């Protein structure tokens, strides 16, 4: 489904591409996009973080907000890649 595919984008192309240090920075920005308490994320791994994001906002919005946070964090290479993969999945359901 479009949902599962968006999640694969978020997790494999997004979070699995950033270092543990960068994941900490990602978590520090997460509350600015999601109504998820910062304390809830602190020891969460990538799969847990992606899942909580999607539970809160839905898959499409989760990917969009991830892209936005990568931009705020100056991870411009990855933000472009996520945007490309997003468009690729969108085409499949247009």
Curated annotation (Swiss-Prot):
<comment type="function">
    <text>Also acts as a tumor suppressor independently of its role in inflammatory response. Able to suppress overt cell proliferation in enterocytes: restricts stem cell proliferation in the intestinal mucosa in an inflammasome-independent manner, contributing to a decrease in the likelihood of colorectal cancer development. AIM2 suppresses cell proliferation by inhibiting phosphorylation of AKT1 at 'Ser-473', preventing AKT1 activation and AKT-mTOR signaling pathway.</text>
</comment>
<comment type="similarity">
    <text>Belongs to the HIN-200 family.</text>
</comment>
<comment type="function">
    <text>Sensor component of the AIM2 inflammasome, which mediates inflammasome activation in response to the presence of double-stranded DNA (dsDNA) in the cytosol, leading to subsequent pyroptosis. Inflammasomes are supramolecular complexes that assemble in the cytosol in response to pathogens and other damage-associated signals and play critical roles in innate immunity and inflammation. Acts as a recognition receptor (PRR): specifically recognizes and binds dsDNA in the cytosol, and mediates the formation of the inflammasome polymeric complex composed of AIM2, CASP1 and PYCARD/ASC.</text>
</comment>
<comment type="subunit">
    <text>Self-associates; forms homooligomers in response to cytosolic double-stranded DNA (dsDNA) and the dsDNA seems to serve as oligomerization platform. Component of AIM2 inflammasome, which consists of a signal sensor component (AIM2), an adapter (PYCARD/ASC), which recruits an effector pro-inflammatory caspase (CASP1). Interacts (via pyrin domain) with PYCARD/ASC (via pyrin domain); interaction is direct. Component of the AIM2 PANoptosome complex, a multiprotein complex that drives inflammatory cell death (PANoptosis). Interacts with PYDC5; disrupts assembly of the AIM2 inflammasome complex.</text>
</comment>
<comment type="subunit">
    <text>(Microbial infection) Interacts with human herpesvirus 8 protein SOX/ORF37; this interaction inhibits AIM2 polymerization and subsequent inflammasome activation.</text>
</comment>
<feature type="domain" description="Pyrin">
    <location>
        <begin position="2"/>
        <end position="88"/>
    </location>
</feature>
<protein>
    <recommendedName>
        <fullName>Interferon-inducible protein AIM2</fullName>
    </recommendedName>
</protein>
């Amino acid at each position: 489904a479009m949902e599962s595919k968006y999640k694969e984008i978020l997790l494999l192309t997004g979070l699995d591409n950033i270092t543990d240090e960068e994941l900490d920075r990602f978590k520090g920005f997460l509350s600015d996009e999601f109504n998820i308490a910062t304390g809830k994320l602190h020891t969460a791994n990538r799969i847990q973080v992606a899942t909580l994001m999607i539970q809160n906002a839905g898959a499409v919005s989760a990917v969009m907000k991830t892209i936005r946070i990568f931009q705020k964090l100056n991870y411009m290479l990855l933000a472009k890649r996520l945007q490309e993969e997003k468009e690729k999945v969108d085409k499949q359901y247009k």
